[PDB]
Amino acid sequence: MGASKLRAVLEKLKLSRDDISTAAGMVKGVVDHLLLRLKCDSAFRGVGLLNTGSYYEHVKISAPNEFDVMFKLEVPRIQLEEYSNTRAYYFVKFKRNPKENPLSQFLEGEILSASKMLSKFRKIIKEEINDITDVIMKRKRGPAVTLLISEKISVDITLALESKSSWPASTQEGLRIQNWLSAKVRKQLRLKPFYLVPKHAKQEETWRLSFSHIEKEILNNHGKSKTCCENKEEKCCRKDCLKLMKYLLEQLKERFKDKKHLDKFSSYHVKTAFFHVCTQNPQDSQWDRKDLGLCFDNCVTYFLQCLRTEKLENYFIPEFNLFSSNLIDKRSKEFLTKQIEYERNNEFPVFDE
Template identity: 55%
Template sequence: MDGAGGRGERGRRGAPPAASRGRGAARGAARSSVRGRGAGGSPDGAGTLRAPRRDASTARRGRPARRASAVRDPAAGGGEAPAAPRGRAPAGRAPAAQRRAEVPDGAVAAPAAIRRAPSAAGALRLREVLSRLTLGRQDVSEASGLVNQVVSQLIQGIRSKDGSFDSIERLGAGSYYEHVKISEPNEFDIMLVMPVTRLQLDECDDTGAYYYLTPKRNPKEKHLFKFLDEDGKLSALKMLQALRQIIKQEVKNITNVEVTVKRKKPGSPAITLQIKNPSAEISVDIILTLEVQQSWPPSTQDGLKIEPWLGRKVRQEFRNKSLYLVAKQNKKEKVPRGNTWRLSFSHIEKAMMNNHGSSKTCCESDGPKCCRKGCLKLLKYLLEQLKMKHPKQLETFCSYHVKTAFFHSCVMWPNDTDWHLGDLDHCFQKYLGYFLDCLQKSQLPHFFIPQYNLLSVEDKASSAFLSRQIKHQLNNRFPIFHEIP
């Protein structure tokens, strides 16, 4: 499930093996734990990556210690990463535990563990993995150009039909447009946004995310009446069926590239197109989205607690934006009727991703670089690879779980210095530690709707299984990052 269409990242090729560890790593790690350097440990016995120390005989022969060379970080626009910092925080920077912001209401507190000194060797390995996840510019250009061509032609055809969808506008959403897509540019989410003046929203369960929609009296959008069910509610099923039929007809008019409409996925709000490219196949999820010009519902009141991170003014600007709803079937309904809609915050999520710094110059061309997006890519890739190995046990998980944990982490560690580019190893582990804590408690609040828990109690066994798999990877320096399927 992602913010718009509910699609997780699919598995792809793994990265080749990294260089082997230094011989002194185990002894250095043992001494570090005895001396107590770097307070705290990782949750539930989870290990942390440590840099191998130099052999004593080498030091006695007078060989100078080599400083870790700067490494170009692919996740941060190609900036140079400084050498990994030493165990104690540099002057002028408070320890991570002191810098961490208060936990927002409804969020799971991050574990007090994972505060050890970053590992230079671990950071180098993680940067190597990130470099292999970076999308090639030529591939991106070809794929995005093809998608733009197909979608533009479809929108023209949709607008020219019976008038039901003549007001739609296009909005790119999801990981590609947030610049956190990994491996291949072969999946795109396109929201077809349809403005509606006013709707009455009635909650259909206790999550605060799913609603029945009823047009207000004398609506301007008279064409909506044809999509009402027998109870006068706006039927998501009827609207999706009508849009799907138009798209299937319009696809036949595209002759310069092969495009097909895939079979409907049960419960999915997306109409999926398959575009055949000479080099690869591209999947495009078309998501019908209603844009309603009215206040956000009460269930969102205590969500989006970004004041420590992005500021109170930005939060208010976000909450003044339109309300988005996508045609999504509520699984909790005993008798599915296809008339439920789910709140979507894809437009807000994209804005936060692309302006993610507490300082307004973070990761800009002439500004300081952080490792926030690099950490998110790594955890997305870790989940993706684990899902490939254990598809049945982890079928309930998707990249939106990782993304939600990321937003909570950005609030708990709100400063750009908390995500220093040279601290990639440490930052990834504290983010991972928070996610593990959520899995252990089966509690991951939706970032915008705190009462909505994304980790269902019914899926507690799956959460425990994923937790065990991640701890195994953490304790063994993430061998799955270097496996070739």
């Protein structure tokens, strides 16, 4: 219950709205030009922009000079094959689509090559950018490409495949929103497409499931009550809490920047944990504005338990553990645990620094 202070922090974050908005505009102008270029290419005919991520969830609170952008590509009749026993990684094949389809230039045997596709994606964007100081492309550190706009704004660009078929079985027990949002809503959401982003596992040519569009839909229609946050009597602190969790993690990564201890943690971990706290606390009355202090403390406490037990399930794919030993070592989780505990015990000093 340090609610008075948390409000002041939120109020401070609002002062960044204009810079972030101005920056978003420049990114948009550039990313629109790029989309027009991509659409001229045979391989990327059904390419489109996916308006997802923190900016579109109204939850981007820092870093006017950093954006993530996702392009989507409609890929009909996809066949998936699970990579090993990872529940989130897959190989991509096609259902009787061998020829007359421009995407087949990207095949290696029967599987679609992420590496070939990304290389052509990058090459197209580079060509376009080379045809036009105010926009450059950073060289490879491996998020397909990264741009620098006006020598100032860094934009990470991700290509995603869109599949309109039903979600893979590993999502069967995920998205536990039945008692928060409804069974009805869960049914409707699961009829929507899923996405696949290029992502190495273990190793190569695998793709990882992505649901950034569902995450956006939940965040922008987030109450048990259909009118949550539409009137003064129903202002909940759910987004405030998510904002504070993200800022906490950003501020900590900034503080221990010289250490490598915090490099593996990202806002996705915070966002994932936050959705789990929404599931555990399904009623809007558990997110009363006046209880901002208790609610933020639930979020922090939840996040600490994930660290201590080394378990943070992907919200969509329950068997995919974001905090497994294979992704993040015990020492890093133990370091973050200690810092969060210190921070909580001292009314969050990093919120002023």
